[model samples]
Target: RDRKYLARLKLPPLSKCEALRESLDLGFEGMCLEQPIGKRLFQQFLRTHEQHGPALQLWKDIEDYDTADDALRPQKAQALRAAYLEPQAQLFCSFLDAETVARARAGGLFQPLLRAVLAHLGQAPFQEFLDSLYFLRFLQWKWLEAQPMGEDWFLDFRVLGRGGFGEVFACQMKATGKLYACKKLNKKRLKKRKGYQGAMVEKKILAKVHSRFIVSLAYAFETKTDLCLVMTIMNGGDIRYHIYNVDEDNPGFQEPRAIFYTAQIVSGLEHLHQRNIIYRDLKPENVLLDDDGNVRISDLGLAVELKAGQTKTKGYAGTPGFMAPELLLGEEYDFSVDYFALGVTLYEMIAARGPFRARGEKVENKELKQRVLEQAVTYPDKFSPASKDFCEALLQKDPEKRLGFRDGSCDGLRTHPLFRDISWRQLEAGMLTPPFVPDSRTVYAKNGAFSGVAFEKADTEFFQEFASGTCPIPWQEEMIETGVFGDLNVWRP
Candidate 1:
């Protein structure tokens, strides 16, 4: 029907018309398609024909309407119509029907006229204003891909946190004074350890996700000696400190505090799982808090991308005392293991000990593994019945029977009586007042750390594939001020 309407506008001869109609079908395929080169070519064609491009400029202005403030639209429609709708106007379209112009003349719309023009012409023209020429130059500028980030762009300030290796440090982006944390991945460690492939996946997953509960990635690049991930600056110390180092006499958090952080973690995991990613490692150590004590599930290297319809994914046992029974069984498991970890974390937060181990237990790693595999969980007299109800379901030995697995959705856990006081909508909206806040003067990091794990070296031949990526992306305040990206920016599918 739309193709038939194309014939209403006087067109080229039969062969030429068919050729153009076929070529223009693409307009319907992806309306408002863009390619800077194609744009430049069209400009050249416009100049060659000596036909001042009025409709062309209107196409661009129409697109910009979406980016405009809503209050400005009505006047802009009236103004845009004045510039192009009048038959005697400098840049007029003869084909736009009276009804569309009549609507705008009464302070109605511009996009309808734009669509009619696009239905006739393919996408741009307005030579009426000299600013149209300037607009095209800016369009080319906006087509830009960011220059690749490297050592020249920023330098490390100070170590913020360390996880044995790949310590993170605060860094300032050049041309901007704001701080961001850069995860420093040593070349030697990456090559001699699991990072030969694992860290890249970490970067990949971090780049793909956009979450308030998870740290956001802004850039990824490499130097002669290391790879760096530039990401959010979370000033609060980790949940580890709040759980174990806050007070000498009392280590575990108050029940409300534990419930608060655990609720945020569930919110975070819901986002990751919805993206088909399994965050195999979830523990207080990996869970960092923002300045307001909100959860930020950091350290995603152990997370795996899961495709739909897969029965179970074989995985690495994440951490001591936190591994799911099925994973300790050395068999394939699914996302339930992550929920299993939530229970371990929950138990640790409220009790300051794992579900199956005492606080500061000195059992060997293997013994700890065996204990979790066969040992049952027990609780203190002070532990609330609701908390035990939540933990027992999540810590269930049977992966299929686990709380998070039984319902195939986070709602099962979100609605539990343990978190009955939490208004999940407010929690995710950042509206809930936090139970703790970081002291700005504090570094909030452990002083120094060393690792005891042995490293098996790997070949450096795969290094060729790790070219310095320009960086995946993130939207910070300055990124908006400088147009690095926009909230309304729709990425190509």
Candidate 2:
């Protein structure tokens, strides 16, 4: 084997090349394995590292070369030179010394072999030919260096929580063993929805916003009938679970605790508004707590981007009691709706009851909606004067007078007496100590697993297409081509 010859060059060990050889040995044992084995092996290697620009370009070239014949060899070679060969050469030039890069770019002895491979390497021994090229070795080094060794597509973990469209699990990456909350959306249910863009918009938004108060997207991939989003795991569970289940001794948080959490929510909402995106749904159920008791805004399914000179959205898409009165009335509303919902959340946190929901009674949806529309809000005498004033400003009947309605900015709340002790800069930077920390120790703590429904593991074969670097969903490709996610940084598995 000429692998012995290459070992003398003091090059990095070709583990991938050796693995490629082993994988091919099974099917190509008794055949003249030149073209078929060579092309197939190269195709697999390129596919495995398709995240790199050079590898992607090479795969496209191989695909074109596979479709073309000997008659179009010269024309194809020129096309490949611009599309594939030159780009690979340029990438090599980026790292190589000036003299070596010039020699490689000159295509000295590599010209004939490149031409032969492009035309028809029908009889040439594939392994020997690939080993002959020093450029290919260097390219493989760069590609392999960029990849995490032995990275697996599917991960295993316990379910953390469940939502309307999918379930969240505490998963660990196979290569790095880093923990993440992997949320899998049922593709069947997604297709059945009003629009097929259920989780795509959320993924795009997560990719855009990077804030301490907002959950961050770590990885995104697709399976057969599911779109999985891996995000930073907030181990403290959501505020709803803590309010109702965990903190039984304290049914409602103290005024200071509510202020601490709501301030973080305000920071997250400010990030969303800065991006021109309105988080229509703001409730305790969507506010997750980290291990340090810091808050992270989650479940961005109802978020929508506003157009230029278009501050209002017409959809009535939020929790019933937590939704803005204007939204429930079917009136056009802007980001002020989020502030109204936040007010409801803050009130619930402080009082352990929604402002619109009648105390000690099971009010019907009709009655509750009417109460939100027309009823005057009454605060308990126990609440501090500042707390009542903060809620009143946010829960204003008119969007024009709402606290966060100052031309799509939430700065007014920062100046309110309720948060007078808060340093906006320090709070945004997470410098303030949390009033309460979660019992959980790790991000993937199994103690906080949701007990309602268990999420079954997906079939291994379901992720084959995605692992091969192909998007199984048609709309995914369309989103990229159409620029639906403006300035989106594409996340790869």
Candidate 3:
């Protein structure tokens, strides 16, 4: 008799315990056929197989769904959900509550009267109800732990540093004294709300993306309580801070410093495109600066993988001001979207304003969308020809004409006149000077000045505690102890 099985699937490396159990669960003798097999091991496999034959089949189906979204239709999540959460319905419910709350907040319905109405309708203590839902979601994700990973595969939130999720502080490790930005996500938050697959995608994408201009993830994992991701600290803050701090009423990139800063962003985009990852979200808020005056891209929450044949995404995402036209259309697009954002980023850096604006004659609040998609991108004539050329290419509705790393088409841009004095090679190496000399009068100035001495990496003695490894953060224990974690009673949910 012959038995069929799925094998050689492309999956992330599995832990030893998970690997061994996976083989045993799939049905294998205690030893190789040629080797003398242990009767006990064989019996164990047989008994386990008998006990979980249906369950094993269900797990295989989950694996299949994990491989490709299209292979299973959109609603196929039901089967996967059952596989992931049958034993943990209570936990899953907590996660669902969080999701509902987060979605409400993201949808701008987190206010007083609406929340009151929602509470009256059944979602009581609005925030607590939300937290409960997330607790349930965490249980579903924990189910995946045993299948491909082990209990050790967890997330840590201390990496979010002092700024919270969006904070960019210049700090040093208390133990190692390495200067790094801590990117934190509450484990209770992940468990309570972040869908398993979504969380995995985030980890995998950020891990693989390597760029000098993009902030690098030095370390990432989960503690017992929180998911923490540590990254290189960009002392210069963000492009928005730089733009707003400038003195000019219409700050065009007439100064080489402004152009230089914008160029770093372009380089970052090039790196992302090479990896087949498209940053659906691009804006000044998402860009930061390293000590060397280089652009370091941040935020992986809105990034997406653009596998071949995957045309359009389902929902509208990304920040409002920087989203591309094709994104608003709800049609399938590609890496070209990043280039469209690049144009806007560059234009904003130069013009110190968004590319389009409403005139007094006929300015409806909603009309901004129409103007972005169809209106001529008006720029000051004083802008350089090379800057204008790249802008036009990036903003084109036709993705083919967009400047990117895909084909050799953009090779000419490497030596383009706009970058006349720029040594592309040196700039790429993080060796070149920024185009503008920021003013020195303020701690944080329009000239891009900050106190380097204050935020510099601490000495190694400061990191002694974390040197061996990390420990429970004070905030996490307090959150759980004080119920600040709200509904994330792991023992309960």
Candidate 4:
């Protein structure tokens, strides 16, 4: 490995006004008017420093190449020229030089272009020019190199909080020694046994989202045997657990906490609709809570991104009770279906149970579920008056008349007295308090071995056994390089 290099460039002394104006124009959104220029400049330099630090170190490591013969040095220098020097030199030419910038700020834009005499100004020394040029060049070169890495996918394996997908297994690097709940699905299992195309679709959709209310994909990657997906580990459990268990034990909404969570769910769905992605699955199970009790919309397997101005699609997909009318009828639908699910979820949130249920004794009876979805959602007298208005708007059966807009400009819904003192923007920005706090409870906190579940316990042997009933992990018989099972860790008994 080459010794690490550091780039220390001589920055021109700039005035406070220059610093303030320059920082803002450079996309630094929030700058304090009260702070000193030196502090501000230091911060800006630190940001730039952190970004270029790695590349600088690499170059420093290979700096002393004089020991090598002329042939090797020339090739190394040429590679460096292409990788660093050329790119920065070009961007330097585009940048507004310090003098030109000072003049432009002092005068108006047109005045600087017309009245400023470039030839009169003394150019900086040659060494200074070379350092500045090289600095800019390396920055641009690093940017070009980093761009391609954007599309690379990685897996973030997470388990839910409790039973089912509720527990999260994977911890962050700091928490690695601890155990959490996690799921496993290798490429072979997904392709050959599970038909995980839906899961893959969910991954793609979730990757495009940026929302505090949405569950984020932690990482994804592929081993020789498996393609893994790790998502946010929400431990407050799911809305389902709260709905089924938290209520009845108490009265009126599961807790005051439910309101904040429901607000986030509505906001999250609003974002999805605005992006033209219709979430067909909006039940309590799919809505999760992050470290903060704020809701995160999870599991996008059934989400469909609709074509612009196209409102309908024909697909027989969704859960039995929580599905919208159009989904069940195989009719084309827009983002409105998500509203329908939101309405059902809202009712579940308040009542801790669904509003409509099968009254008849027959197990196979479809009339109750069908009728409930078809009929407009009405607020029962037993529920609060505030809930009735909210429920009616959300549960509207007609897609066109569904109460809220896809863009989240719910005429009166956003500012309704129902959510008095709540700011939707603040919530989405993650500045406000989430409804509930995480247990901060660890699974098997004292265990010497990994807690809850690891790959060794959950899937490796167990799934191999499970697959043995069908097709076991293809074991390598011969020592062949670059063949199947090439990277497998074999057992030596």
lDDT of 1 by residue, 31-90 (tens): 223433234434444454445467566666676664555577676666677677766887
C-alpha TM-scores of all predictions: 0.68, 0.61, 0.53, 0.56
| Among all candidates shown, the one with the greatest lDDT | 1
What ranking emerges by TM-score with the best candidate at the front? 1, 2, 4, 3
Candidate 1 at residue 76, lDDT?
Answer: 67
Error of 2 at 489 (Å): 22
Ranking by lDDT: 1, 2, 3, 4
Q: Model 2: runs farther than 4 Å from truth?
A: 1-151, 193-195, 405-408, 441-493
- Tens digit of per-residue lDDT, candidate 4, span 435-467: 556565732121112122234344444333322
- Predicted structure 4, TM vs. truth: 0.56
lDDT tens readout by residue for model 2, 399-437: 887889465567767889999777675687677888878
Native-vs-model 3 lDDT?
0.51
